[PDB]
């Protein structure tokens, strides 16, 4: 198994005031 | 199994204020 | 397992006030 | 397993008020 | 088992007010 | 002319991540 | 002409990421 | 003509991440 | 004209990492 | 015209990251 670029921007992100993720197996996230 | 690119963004993103998952196993995401 | 490039910017990003995470296991994250 | 660049950033980033996190497996963050 | 680079800058950065973890195992971090 | 108390809230808010404007005459709001 | 609490919180607020005013004339904001 | 509390908090705050403004007549706001 | 205690906090602030203005007449503020 | 008390805190403040501001007329702050 391989994993690659799970998430991938390619010009430009204003602002995250949120969740950026990959790969999310378990645990608690509160954005 | 090969995982890649999963999400593509190819251009400007404003702002995120939520969930940007690429791959969703398990667990719990409040945004 | 071979992991790499989870998430992956490719251009300015503005800010981040959020949770940015590779690869999420366990505990507990607030932002 | 070889873990690599979970986390890629290509260019500048304005600022980080949130949590930038490669690899999460148990704790607590409060950003 | 074997980790590197978990996080990566490869530009400016210019302020850091939050966190930056490479492995979080444990433990509680308020910034 | 009165006003008074012209948005009111008795408990708990979670977050806001949009616009909460009391009187609103002129200007652009992009939330 | 008399302005008073135009906005009235009165419990816990738990956080804000948007845009919070009470009176607005003018001007862009941009949250 | 009088202005008085035009944003009233009588609780906790967690944290502020964008603008709380009170009287909003000219300029640019960026949060 | 009278202004007076036009943003109001009556508990804890936790922690602010945005803008909190009172009046705002003309300028650029970045937060 | 007479300005009193623009911003007002009643209690304890965790920490500033960002800007406090009374009375902004022009110039630019960065925070």
Do not use: Y
């Amino acid at each position: 198994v391989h994993h690659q670029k799970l998430v991938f921007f390619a010009e430009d992100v204003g602002s995250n005031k949120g969740a950026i993720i990959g790969l999310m197996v378990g645990g608690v996230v509160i954005a």
